[PDB]
Write an enzyme that holds these catalytic residues in place. Structure first.
Site, mmCIF file in Angstrom:
data_model
loop_
_atom_site.group_PDB
_atom_site.id
_atom_site.type_symbol
_atom_site.label_atom_id
_atom_site.label_comp_id
_atom_site.label_asym_id
_atom_site.label_seq_id
_atom_site.Cartn_x
_atom_site.Cartn_y
_atom_site.Cartn_z
ATOM 1 N N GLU D 71 -76.198 -49.644 -14.461
ATOM 2 C CA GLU D 71 -76.842 -48.364 -14.256
ATOM 3 C C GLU D 71 -76.273 -47.770 -12.958
ATOM 4 O O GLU D 71 -76.869 -47.955 -11.886
ATOM 5 C CB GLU D 71 -78.391 -48.551 -14.258
ATOM 6 N N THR D 145 -80.245 -54.821 -16.363
ATOM 7 C CA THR D 145 -79.129 -55.701 -16.068
ATOM 8 C C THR D 145 -79.563 -56.797 -15.116
ATOM 9 O O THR D 145 -79.096 -57.940 -15.210
ATOM 10 C CB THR D 145 -77.980 -54.890 -15.485
ATOM 11 N N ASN D 228 -88.378 -52.562 0.310
ATOM 12 C CA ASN D 228 -87.039 -53.038 0.590
ATOM 13 C C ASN D 228 -86.895 -53.376 2.059
ATOM 14 O O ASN D 228 -86.172 -54.307 2.432
ATOM 15 C CB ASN D 228 -86.028 -51.976 0.162
ATOM 16 N N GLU D 254 -80.365 -78.103 2.655
ATOM 17 C CA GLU D 254 -81.396 -78.948 3.181
ATOM 18 C C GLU D 254 -82.691 -78.641 2.471
ATOM 19 O O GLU D 254 -83.350 -79.559 1.995
ATOM 20 C CB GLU D 254 -81.499 -78.754 4.690
HETATM 21 MG MG MG Z 1 -79.205 -51.139 -14.499
#
Ligand code: MG
Ligand code: MG
Ligand code: MG
EC number: 3.6.5.-
Lengths: 429, 441, 441, 441
Positions: D71, D145, D228, D254
């Site tokens: 996209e 996706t 975000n 670890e």
């Molecule tokens: Mg996409």
């Protein structure tokens, strides 16, 4: 051989002896299966005076099961060491006393005594020189006392020479697990003052206090408690079970404990009692355990030596020490708090030692002294009996058993008579 | 060895029974047909199901209880329902034409019709049983046979055995909510013929079931499914001692003349808890003290009679699960502590502990959340006389107007049964009147 | 090490709080933003502000107190006021729709709404604190959350920590002056749910504030500014020991079972002085004896209940400033000397000195004049039961007429809460009735 | 020496990535073009940016991360955005026609279209790298996706290198908030093809981002900018050890078979704090204990699955800044102290400290306030299975109705992928079912 037997009824007591014989098994290190797996003949030397070898070495108790409903019989029947038992003794009931003591004493009392006293008698023939036997129930109902009253009467007549050392549960002043307690209790205690040879008080609240404060435990049950008491009741025969540089049996005890036969209600102290960390605070000395011995908080009964006066006091020591200490602390203490020592009983403290302590510990202490502080106990219970007997509250459950009230008067002015009796002995010099 | 058996009557009543045997069968998890999912190991120490679920020579374990009611429609639903493998045909006795809530009908009129069949069934079970302690009898002052025919039922069954205990679960006319208006007639006509044929019994009212399920179960819109479930729990725990290990496996006969000290006023309340949601099961901890202090909430009182208006006499807080003698014990000190509460002082304490170690089991599809500890406060106080007084005053006037009396006089009862039964509640009013009097000096 | 924290509720209540933290912040002189005017030198020997003003990594020293009330308008003024640098957002919890002076609303109805936020804040502070002795809780039987929601507040907070002290400042319905008429309901419903959730607390009435500020402060026309200032002084000195060196830096917990010997009747009076004018600051000398003898003027009694009608029990005359043990001491002999005064003789003397060396600080714009010595007569007598009796008689009739009851019954309280709470003041009337009885022989 | 590289997919996913590289580039303060503001001195002891920012022969320091999604609109915004000097063309691979949230499309259909370009880019970077530990892969079960093509991506990349770590950041369908309804299909079809191609990965849900930014950041109206940003912080600290000196510079590998002890249930929660305002940065102190005790607030739990409903297994409280081993350590005792919390007892403690000395850096224009100490509670419990169960029940019915199935069957997936993948969550339900079972005796 001064061997003895056990008989337990009692809503709890039936469990109590389960724990008890359990403990003794540990001190004899014999497998649950019934054969010995220990390391000294000494466990086998005097083993018989509680146990009984069987063909093939099945080692068995001299116990007698009382119950009016098999559940307990299944319970301990479901018990570890349960294969250490004899199926014969599983003498129970099909009804239950409902704890109306007349029910367990006339109704079911007369119903199932016979099979008991028979088989018990077969145990009597099984006993060579029977020092006695140990009964266990509670003094507030009928699950034990219902029939155990009849036991003490019957065997007492049947064996007027044998010792009857009786432990039964006393209702604590605060918590009333049932309200018919004053009546069962009073009716019983009339009997027990006449017929029982030794008695020691069995409160729950003391055992709670021990577990919670001095044991520092939060989770109380019965089983631990019976551990705490069968510790002592297990200690009592130690010399009688094992050598002792200063030995004394129940005959030497009671005869060396009681001035007049009406005084065989005794209070109890056993120790040490710590939680795990305590040893890394403190260590063990005879003077130490002594410093617990006269502790009201170990005073596991509703009576207060701090309020009453030691009519008598005694120490049961199992271990390996120097009596030169022991006596020294003895006399020291008999001075230190002389006032709670009754007067004209010179050296009202008395001594003992068992060459071996109980397992796991190096030194043992036991205190079954007898003050007269119990007067508040009988006064209380008699008082509640008085109130609802003014009301006749639950007389109908009662007279439905077909007793008279005049019996209630009999144990009544009776028990008051015993109280005031202790008053004059306490109030005298 | 320790048997009891259940009897079911009146529409709501056998509703209760259906819920109950659904329950117990769930709780021992024996599948509805009559088999357990797996084989039963041989052991000893105590009984099991054997009390009620009936051993066959195979996976067929039917209850020891009996259906009797003259309104036979609904019972057929059991006759049809999933447990049609569970129950047994001769377990089923019904009447076609019920009482029409004529007490005097299924008590007198149709009273004559099915009694002998009932008694024969009883003989088959008790003969089948050995140490049957007592009798579980369920009915209702509404589904009219629940009053009338049950009235004859104990009236004769008592005279049959006697020595068995009478375990009485019947419903009482809700204080302001109701089902009919002849309820006065049903009730009091039952009562004077109830008492001397009753040993002891509890009074379940519904409005409490509603209010409490809706607040405490967080219920929005309940019915007899929820009710029958709730009484299912309470009876589920009132007899655990004979079913499961508990520290003080107290017994019914034990309860009898100790909870109800005198002979007369031998009924009681019962506020079970902890009834909460899955969203209150979490967001909560549900202490022994919470169930305990909570156990005496008058607003928790599971029958619409204010405890705070009465004075308690006994409280058998039998407990399911991980209970501590000490913790509860101190809670009982806390109960002595409650200033607002007042006790038949001539019975200073009459307490009687119950600590059964199995915590509760939950019925899937139910609204109650899962917990660790159960309480049953079978307690007896002075309070409950009042709503009776409402019953005899309501009935007082209505009967004064001779309302409906033609219905009953038509079926073979006499008027002195009415006025005299009012003397009956007169006497019992003297009883709650007197026993609550504090003994002088 | 020695922490306390303040809680604020009800319109007048958080008014008090605002005055208070204005005060203390003035008194340690830390600027309203949160900084001190200058750097703090490192030293030892005792605590400082650290009790209440909260250390940051910089000049940000916020109180350790919390606002809670369901009438959120006014608190916003703090949200707007000069100290909007002072306080802290999460310090602020309010309700939108207050109780409407339904006790049962912000106690029951809206009681459910903000509790958890409150407790979380409490955990943040007490977790932030170490040796927090006790709890400063302020509310009012008027700004209705001050009764209801506070009632739940201690009701649960006590059950949270317990071991902390309960420092109770709430206002009491003035004897003839008032704010509403449901005040009976607010108060007594609070009281039966107040006592067993309270450790100890004092009763501030306003009419005394008026009469005394107008005569002793020479005030012409006062309001909550003056009142809140005055209580600001009294609390300013009731805790100086944990803030400032004094000879006998007595403590709250110390006060607890010593001032209020028994558990029950654990409230008291408090007549602070010396409140005078600048023209009486001059034209006067203000002796220790003047504050002292003056301290027991019934007409100086800062809550409208005549001491002379009661018999004193304890008097913790904690003193600010240049105090002499001897001089005060002989004044206490003078207090033994007072024929008109009569003491719970079985507590012959129960006195407990307080001599803190800092004399008082004054708030600019205030009416009180500056002095050298402060007194707080936290004293407990028999007298205060009476006005209670007025409360239960007033409330007695009004409740008898069922006035307003629809309001409360509408929100989820039961009637036995009312009559029983009247039994509560019955008992406490027995308490002030009995403890005042002179032990025989 | 110690490299990692980031992969970005799905609309929200590359949104996250943009926020992230904005962040790190801010944090090493290398200007958006690719240069640092000033020359870099030659030193040793540890790596620097070199992990991710790519050294040139000049002031050109590009990330080591890759964009892949079908996209391609939004990514162009990066292709246009300020960092168009930052990134690099061959860093950019996108698809034109995305999946339409057909998992099976960009996984199958368009799955075939861009894979090889992706792998070549990967070979260019890993060949460019030396001690690349593991793989940062970002995608979303929404921007389709992010599920499908990523599914092939790890499906093959794992089979390429294997020995690298799989660092999994993808978003999980919010419990009641959502983006579509085929999300069941996306998710579970991903999951059965996710697990055995995943090493370990965390589940970020948004609704927590909302609720917590709005309360804790005091946010009024948030979006993917705030989200975000927030995930930007959390990943900012989850790898500091390889970027900055800390006492116990723990590493991913670890973390791997130590946090997720068994192989199977290898996901987790992550509640970062301290997220507060500038007005709570002041009015607060923000103790190690505050971040620490606060770290386990279930209400602070940064993914909408109640920890208190689960039993913790591991907790890697890696810390930024001035941390004390002792202070945190005792806080961990405090965490052992928490009665409400319950641990996979066969893993009694599994703790693993992280004390990196750099306290956090803040992004200008952000809402989080500045502090001295950071926590990342990457912890794993039993709780998280439930919301999965919601996913498989929702998907259960919807799939039962064959809803949308034409869409996927149209693109080359078989039905047994569906039912069998439901067996997959069946097994994992057995896993959270079993590992939570307490080992007997
Ligand atoms: Mg996409
Ligand atoms: Mg019918
Ligand atoms: Mg308000």
């Amino acid at each position: 051989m001064r061997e003895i037997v056990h008989i337990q009824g009692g809503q709890c007591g039936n469990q109590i002896g389960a724990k008890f014989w359990e403990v003794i098994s540990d001190e004899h290190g014999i497998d649950p299966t019934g054969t010995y797996h220990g390391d000294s003949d000494l466990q086998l030397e005097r083993i018989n005076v509680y146990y009984n070898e069987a063909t093939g070495g099945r080692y068995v108790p001299r116990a007698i099961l009382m119950d009016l409903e098999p559940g307990t019989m299944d319970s301990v029947r479901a018990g570890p060491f349960g294969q250490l038992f004899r199926p014969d003794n599983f003498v129970f009931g099909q009804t239950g006393a409902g704890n109306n003591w007349a029910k367990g004493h006339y109704t079911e009392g007369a119903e199932l005594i016979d099979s008991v006293l028979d088989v018990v008698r077969k145990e009597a023939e099984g006993c060579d020189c029977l020092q006695g036997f140990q009964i266990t129930h509670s003094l507030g109902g009928g699950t034990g006392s219902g029939m155990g009253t009849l036991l003490i009467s019957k065997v007492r007549e049947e064996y007027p020479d044998r010792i009857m050392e009786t432990f039964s549960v006393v209702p604590s002043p605060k918590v009333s697990d049932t309200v018919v307690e004053p009546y069962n209790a009073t009716l019983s205690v009339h009997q027990l003052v006449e017929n029982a040879d030794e008695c020691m008080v069995i409160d729950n609240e003391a055992l709670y206090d021990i577990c919670f404060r001095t044991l520092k435990l939060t989770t109380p049950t019965y089983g631990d408690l019976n551990h705490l008491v069968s510790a002592a009741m297990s200690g009592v025969t130690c010399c009688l079970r094992f050598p002792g540089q200063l030995n004394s049996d129940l005959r030497k005890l009671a005869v060396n404990l009681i001035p007049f036969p009406r005084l065989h209600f005794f209070m109890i102290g056993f120790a040490p009692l710590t939680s795990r960390g305590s040893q890394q605070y403190r260590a063990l000395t005879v003077p130490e355990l002594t410093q617990q011995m006269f502790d009201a908080k170990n005073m596991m009964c509703a009576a207060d030596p701090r309020h009453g006066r030691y009519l008598t006091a005694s120490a049961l020591f199992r271990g390996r020490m120097s009596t030169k200490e022991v006596d020294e602390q003895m006399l020291n203490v008999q001075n230190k708090n002389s006032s709670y020592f009754v007067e004209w009983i010179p050296n009202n403290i008395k001594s003992s030692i068992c060459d071996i302590p109980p397992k796991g510990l190096k030194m043992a202490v036991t205190f079954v002294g007898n003050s007269t502080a119990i007067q508040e106990m009988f006064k209380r219970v008699a008082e509640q009996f008085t109130a609802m007997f003014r009301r006749k509250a639950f007389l109908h459950w009662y007279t439905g058993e077909g007793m008279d009230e005049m019996e209630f008067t009999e144990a009544e002015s009776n028990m008051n008579d015993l109280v005031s009796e202790y008053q004059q002995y306490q109030d005298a010099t | 060895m320790r048997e009891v058996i259940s009897i079911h009557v009146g529409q709501g009543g056998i509703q209760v029974g259906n819920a109950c045997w659904e329950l117990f069968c769930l709780e021992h998890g024996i599948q509805p047909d009559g088999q357990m999912p797996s084989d039963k190991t041989i052991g000893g120490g105590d009984d099991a199901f054997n009390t009620f679920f009936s051993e066959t020579g195979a996976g067929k374990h039917v209850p020891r209880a009996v259906f009797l009611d003259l309104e036979p429609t609904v019972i057929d639903e059991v006759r049809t329902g999933t447990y049609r493998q569970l129950f047994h045909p001769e377990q089923l006795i019904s009447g076609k034409e019920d009482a029409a809530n004529n007490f005097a009908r299924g008590h007198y009129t149709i009273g004559k019709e099915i009694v002998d069949l009932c008694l024969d069934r009883i003989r088959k079970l008790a003969d089948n049983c050995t140490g049957l302690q007592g009798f579980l009898v369920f009915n209702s002052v509404g589904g009219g046979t629940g009053s009338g025919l049950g009235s004859l039922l104990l009236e004769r069954l008592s005279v049959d055995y006697g020595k068995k205990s009478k375990l009485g679960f019947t419903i009482y006319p809700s204080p302001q909510v109701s089902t009919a208006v002849v309820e006065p007639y049903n009730s009091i006509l039952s009562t004077h013929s109830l008492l001397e044929h009753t040993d002891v019994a509890v009074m379940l009212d519904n409005e409490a079931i509603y209010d409490i399920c809706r607040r405490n179960l967080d219920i929005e819109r309940p019915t007899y499914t929820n009710l029958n479930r709730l009484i299912a729990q309470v009876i589920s725990s009132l007899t655990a001692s004979l079913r499961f290990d508990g520290a003080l496996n107290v017994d019914i006969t034990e309860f009898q003349t100790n909870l109800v000290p005198y002979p007369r006023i031998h009924f009681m309340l019962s506020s079970y808890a902890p009834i909460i949601s899955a969203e209150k099961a979490y967001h909560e901890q549900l202490s022994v003290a919470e169930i305990t202090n909570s156990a005496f909430e008058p607003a928790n009182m599971m029958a619409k009679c204010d405890p705070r208006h009465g004075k308690y006499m006994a409280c058998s807080m039998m407990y399911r699960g991980d209970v501590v003698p000490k913790d509860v014990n101190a809670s009982i000190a806390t109960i002595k502590t409650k200033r607002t509460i007042q006790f038949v002082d001539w019975c200073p304490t009459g307490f009687k502990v119950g600590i059964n170690y199995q915590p509760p089991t939950v019925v899937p599809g139910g609204d109650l959340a899962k917990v660790m500890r159960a309480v049953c406060m079978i307690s007896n106080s002075t309070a409950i006389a009042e709503v009776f007084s409402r019953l005899d005053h309501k009935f007082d006037l209505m009967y004064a107007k001779r309302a409906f009396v033609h219905w009953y006089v038509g079926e073979g009862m006499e008027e002195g049964e009415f006025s005299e039964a009012r003397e009956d509640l007169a006497a019992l009013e003297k009883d709650y009147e007197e026993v609550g009097i504090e003994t002088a000096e």
